[PDB]
Design a protein around this nucleic acid. Structure first.
Lengths: 175, 175
DNA sequence: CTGGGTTAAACCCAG
DNA sequence: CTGGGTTAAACCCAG
């Protein structure tokens, strides 16, 4: 059981918006988004069929041990506290993120933001929040979507078994 | 007794700085500031010789009934609460503002600022603070220096007699 | 409402 | 430290 990123986020097709802009932030197209056929990022679990949720959050482009990136993910579907959580189709085993937007935190706020990511307890690679002290070290123009998948356990209704976090190609703030 | 603006502020020779920039804001040269001979704004009282202080503050470029402009004047000499107060040479009857800088308030702060100008009670033309409600109406790229001169009264040490406020030519934020 | 240019606010480099 | 360009953050126009 592992997750495959079947359609990668287009690396330069969405402007990140600040909270001060009061928008929906939009949606991140897929690499293959086309003229008459729009696309969106999508994953696919392998080796397993059953209940399984997915947590998506921003991690740094930076290092194999990517760290929580301050930026919040907002979206009509499942996004709370910059983290976005949705349940996967229990038979097809795939999900397509059609409303996943990136709301960029500005420098002044990086700390309080990372402060919150910690409360929520979202830390894909067990990186801790050391980077919250050194805020300028974080590149606020690039991120990667992190997909942490959790299989239903044995304790019915409790998604307990975590598959290994999978990181997407880098997404760069478009102008 | 009236005040003459003997050397007018150069209209385009100083960048206004935000409080967030943590500088001295500089000094406003005079219209005639030259290569080997730098100049600065200056006034001259006429019709009177004696004690007399001067209050300088920013008013709008706008209308003969200029209103308190949010921007604060800072300067090594006499500037407190964006308002700057200095005592005039009791014999020559002139003062030359060699350290008068303009610290620009940003939109978010216009209100609280004008709020404060009111507390201080600086309102040259009896305009009230109606403009504090409509903050976008104020052009944050131009100001005029207002020189309110007060003659010593009869109550020794109390500058009581106000001469009529005199307004300087417009000063425009340089890039 | 959305994409995307423009102004404003911050920041920072060179002298 | 200063002048003044540049990035970041806000804002806003056109479609």
């Amino acid at each position: 059981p592992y997750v495959e990123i079947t359609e990668q986020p287009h690396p330069k097709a969405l402007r990140f918006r600040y909270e001060c802009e009061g928008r929906s932030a939009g949606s991140i197209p897929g690499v293959n988004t086309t003229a008459e056929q729009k696309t969106f990022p999508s994953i696919q679990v392998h080796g397993y069929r059953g209940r399984a949720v997915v947590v998506v959050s921003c991690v740094t482009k930076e290092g194999p041990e990517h760290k929580p990136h301050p930026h919040n993910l907002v979206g009509k579907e499942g996004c709370k506290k910059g983290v976005c959580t949705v349940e996967i189709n229990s038979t097809t085993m795939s999900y397509t993120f059609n409303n996943l937007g990136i709301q960029c935190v500005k420098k002044k706020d990086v700390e309080e933001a990372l402060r919150l990511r910690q409360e929520i307890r979202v830390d894909p690679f067990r990186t801790g929040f050391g980077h919250a002290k050194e805020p300028g070290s974080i590149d606020l123009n690039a991120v990667r979507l992190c997909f942490q998948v959790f299989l239903e356990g044995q304790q019915r209704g409790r998604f307990t078994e975590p598959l290994t976090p999978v990181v997407s190609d880098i997404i760069y703030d478009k102008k």
